[PDB]
Amino acid sequence: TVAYIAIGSNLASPLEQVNAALKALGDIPESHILTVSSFYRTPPLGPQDQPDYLNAAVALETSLAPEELLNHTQRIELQQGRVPRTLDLDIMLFGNEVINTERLTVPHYDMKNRGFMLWPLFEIAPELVFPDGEMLRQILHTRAFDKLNKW
Ligand SMILES: CC1(C)Nc2nc(N)[nH]c(=O)c2N=C1C(=O)NCC(=O)N(CC(=O)NC[C@H]1O[C@@H](n2cnc3c(N)ncnc32)[C@H](O)[C@@H]1O)CP(=O)(O)O
Numbered sequence: 001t002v003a004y005i006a007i008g009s010n011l012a013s014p015l016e017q018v019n020a021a022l023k024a025l026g027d028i029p030e031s032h033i034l035t036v037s038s039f040y041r042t043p044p045l046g047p048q049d050q051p052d053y054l055n056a057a058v059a060l061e062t063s064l065a066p067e068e069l070l071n072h073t074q075r076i077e078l079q080q081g082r083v084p085r086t087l088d089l090d091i092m093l094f095g096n097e098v099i100n101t102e103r104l105t106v107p108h109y110d111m112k113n114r115g116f117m118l119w120p121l122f123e124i125a126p127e128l129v130f131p132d133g134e135m136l137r138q139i140l141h142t143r144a145f146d147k148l149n150k151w
Pocket residue numbers: 007008009042043044045046053055074077088089090091092103104105106107108110116
C-alpha cells in the first residue's frame with residue numbers, strides 16, 4: 001500500500017531534519033521510498049510570528065498496518081527532537097483507506113485546506129484521486145492555493 005507522508009520543519013536550518021527524516025523513512029521495515037517531492041519554503045499557516053517552514057511530501061510503499069507505520073513515524077519524530085517545530089510527520093493518505101480511530105484520522109483532517117500539503121503531493125502524485133472521488137488537481141484548482149517556492 002502506498003502511504004503519502006507530509007514533512008514539515010521550521011527550525012532555522014531545517015535541511016538537517018528533513019534530510020534525516022527521509023533517511024529514517026527509508027529504514028522503516030517492509031517499506032520503500034518511491035518518490036520524494038522538491039523541498040518548499042512556505043509561510044506558516046496559523047500564527048505568523050514564526051519562521052518559514054520547509055515542506056515536502058514522500059510516497060512510501062509499505063506492507064505495514066497504518067498504525068504500525070504511525071509508530072515508526074512517531075519514532076522518527078522523537079529521535080530527532082519532537083517531544084519552533086523540529087519535525088512533524090503527517091500521514092496524509094494510506095492507499096484508499098478511510099480511518100477514524102483514536103490514533104489516526106486518514107485522510108489527514110485538514111490536508112484539503114493546506115496548500116503546503118497539497119502542492120508537494122501534487123508534484124509526486126499528479127493524477128491522485130481521494131477516497132471520496134475528488135481529484136487532487138481539481139481541489140487545487142477550486143481552492144486556488146498559490147503555488148509554492150522551492151527552498
Ligand atoms: C502549524 C501548521 C498548522 N502550519 C503549517 N504551516 C506551514 N507553512 N507548514 C506546515 O507544515 C504547517 N504545519 C502545521 C501543523 O500543525 N502540521 C502538523 C499537524 O497537522 N498537526 C500537529 C502535529 O504535531 N502533527 C504531527 C503528529 O500527528 C500525528 N499524526 C500523523 N499522521 C496522523 C493522522 N493521519 N491522524 C492523526 N494523527 C496523525 C503523529 O503523532 C505526529 O506526531 C495536527 P493538528 O494540531 O493540526 O491537529
